[PDB]
Design a binder for this molecule. Structure first.
Ligand SMILES: CCCN1C(=O)c2ccc(Cl)cc2Nc2ncccc21
Ligand SMILES: CCCN1C(=O)c2ccc(Cl)cc2Nc2ncccc21
Lengths: 129, 130, 130, 129
């Protein structure tokens, strides 16, 4: 049939969808689930290269699926898998403890840690047919 | 067996692609032709809604296929078809006469007129396999 | 000859300073004492309004002078004075008992309770020369 | 008898004031003028060091007085003075032409170019008594 639905970008084995507006991590997490998708999950250097290129026209922040309760907990994706250490280093204030947890976002090709209640753009991803 | 090639966005009956770099209108037109495509052509409110949504995360200008020789000439797409007046209003300095004509671009949901020799990003469009 | 020293914010009858790094409550209390100052003490709605405004561009937590041994003990400032109940409500896990006591912090305009050994930024305050 | 008014930070020969929220460059410029002040003007490495330190607790963008009509025009401060050579490099999409001009902003210690209709925090600066 067709690899990706309308409005989505087909890349490799996945479909990517940029959000129309800025919402908190919980709102972005919910939006992806409603479209049978998860938030952005980076599994390879090729995935990171594609995402940095697709966000090269934006100076805005983009919420990914990586998050943790506090610095004593590990960085995990929505499905419960861990982050591959070689892919990228989470910069910024990683040692801070926020009441709604610490969520990871990508901005200008770099990944930074931040409070989950902040409004930011998002990228949803799902398997391509 | 598939509506659009890789890296393109499938919408309605067209495939849309954002340009890799900022070039003048003539070079932007050439780039689309090189990918078997034309510069962005907006025919409906549903096309403008989609484009504004696709460019919502960018503060950059994106060229489209609308252009004219000078203010005394009508705004026309690359194929020669005219602009539907209800779709949108072309803002900015529309009364200016540039040596390489006046080309239109979309930025932050709004359409503005500008000199065609200015470097700007672009959106290419081509028919989807349906 | 001047109300506050360099890098401090002058407000009302006090000088406020944001800490250079994130440390546990005891180290944050020590840092203020080294600058001839104490941890943030909120005595009025005007003081709270100022602090929320000064921290409006930060998503980080800031320690204050409010702390208690456990939930059975009252919330008290460093000098021993109590909290005015109308000023604000301490949110979060207030019913928890930590080995180094429970310390209060302000983040995004709201006041939350937390373990005193956690590294957090802080606001120091001292009297202004008037 | 006081170099800076209440709520301002005294640094060197100036007074600095952080904005309470985010507004477009024109509104930020208006706010500073209302307080007998101008948008942030960096004249030395010591001024840049102070600003980066004062914004170290924020991952948000902050507006500065540096702006230009388009890439063919020079980067100028509000008073008309040019940008000093070895202070900083303006990063990002400097080759773009926005309808409301290109205004410079500081974020995470780095200076980037951007569209002036975007809402951002701001820093006002005026001489100290
Ligand atoms: C979630 C916030 C996204 N955002 C920026 O990230 C942003 C980045 C740079 C500047 Cl100067 C100003 C900015 N503010 C802003 N204004 C309007 C639309 C989006 C933005
Ligand atoms: C001018 C916009 C300021 N801003 C950010 O710059 C910002 C930075 C990072 C993230 Cl993840 C999300 C962000 N959005 C945001 N949400 C709430 C208050 C402020 C912000």
């Amino acid at each position: 049939h067709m690899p990706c639905p309308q409005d989505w970008i087909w890349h490799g084995e996945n479909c990517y969808l940029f959000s129309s507006g800025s919402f908190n991590w919980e709102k972005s997490q919910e939006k992806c689930l409603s479209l049978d998708a998860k938030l952005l999950k980076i599994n390879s250097t090729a995935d990171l290269d594609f995402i940095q290129q697709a966000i090269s026209y934006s100076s805005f922040p983009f919420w990914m699926g990586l998050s943790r309760r506090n610095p004593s907990y590990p960085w995990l994706w929505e499905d419960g898998s861990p982050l591959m250490p070689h892919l990228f280093r989470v910069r910024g204030a990683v040692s801070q403890t926020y009441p709604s947890g610490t969520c990871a976002y990508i901005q200008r090709g770099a990944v930074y840690a931040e409070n989950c209640i902040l409004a930011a753009f998002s990228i949803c991803q799902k398997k391509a047919n």
